[PDB]
């Protein structure tokens, strides 16, 4: 009986050290692992016969649906095509922002004016919106 338990404990210890080099040592994007809310910093403490871990994470709520576009292509000049970086292009519902489209973070609803920092140049596609007038990131 003791031989069996010893082997299972050794394997359990291997699991813990891998979490120390993932869930504890750095932020991780793999999901599944760590707490169930993306991953942000986690901690570990000594426990009898083992280690006790705790994890912290983001728990989103009150989801709303918004209109969004796959990308924008500046239709007065079709070779200019852009798409958001780590975020989305959404129709603007904010009174502060004159821009027809707005940029948001993907973790939280928070519209912003469109600027070059939030987008990248991409190959054209037929589903990208056809903006024939004012598109600032770069304006030309």
């Amino acid at each position: 009986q003791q031989l069996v338990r010893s082997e299972s404990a050794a394997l359990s210890a291997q699991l813990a050290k891998d979490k120390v080099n993932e869930c504890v040592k750095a932020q991780s994007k793999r999901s599944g692992f760590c707490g169930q809310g993306t991953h942000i910093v986690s901690f570990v403490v000594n426990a009898p016969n083992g280690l006790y871990f705790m994890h912290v994470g983001y728990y989103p709520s009150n989801h709303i649906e918004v209109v969004s576009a796959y990308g924008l292509c500046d239709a007065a000049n079709p070779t200019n095509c852009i798409a958001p970086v780590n975020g989305y292009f959404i129709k603007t519902n904010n009174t502060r922002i004159v821009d027809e489209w707005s940029y948001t973070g993907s973790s939280f609803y928070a519209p912003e004016p469109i600027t070059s920092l939030n987008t990248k140049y991409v190959a054209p596609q037929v589903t990208y919106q056809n903006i024939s007038t004012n598109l600032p990131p770069p304006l030309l």
Partner: antibody
Amino acid sequence: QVQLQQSGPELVRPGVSVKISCKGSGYTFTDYAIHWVKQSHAKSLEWIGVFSTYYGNTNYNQKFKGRATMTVDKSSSTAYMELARLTSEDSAIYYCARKSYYVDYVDAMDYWGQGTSVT
Amino acid sequence: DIVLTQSPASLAVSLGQRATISCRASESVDNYGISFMNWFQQKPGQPPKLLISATSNQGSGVPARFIGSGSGTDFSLNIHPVEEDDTAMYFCQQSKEVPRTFGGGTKLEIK
């Protein structure tokens, strides 16, 4: 309690640039875009332009892109528009207005300035 | 922007009478069903006032009597209780595209 305070009317001679002001009151001024509209007759009106009060971003009616411009004094909670090169054809009743969304994704003028005019 | 037109140029009615205003558009205004149609009210000596929005026949500053209607190029306004303080010019407005133009309007009157 929202109010808009347009500057008084004037019989300005042509070729003079014309500044008009519209102070806001009773709301936080910087969170809403300002709009201007031109009325040449009670049945003939056209939009002039829009200016953000926080980011300073603007758009104009295509006919006014070489004409009127807008600026904002955020410390005074006030918005301004200045016409370039007045002509007798530009006499109008001018109205400032504030952006709103009574329906999601639908712009509406909400509160209006009392009106001012130039001739 | 899409051209808006309206008719009859003016209509006079008895007090409490139902009335309507046609407001055809040169091009459909629907974008994903958003419509972008607002109606405004104005009287001499005052600024235009918002009345309704395409999904708001109450609210947007008014009582339920102001009924906007239609889709595509077919818009209209229906007011079942027109009254003395409804004597005003009425203007369809387009929020879909810059310049954000709006119709020349029509005027209701009490006979």
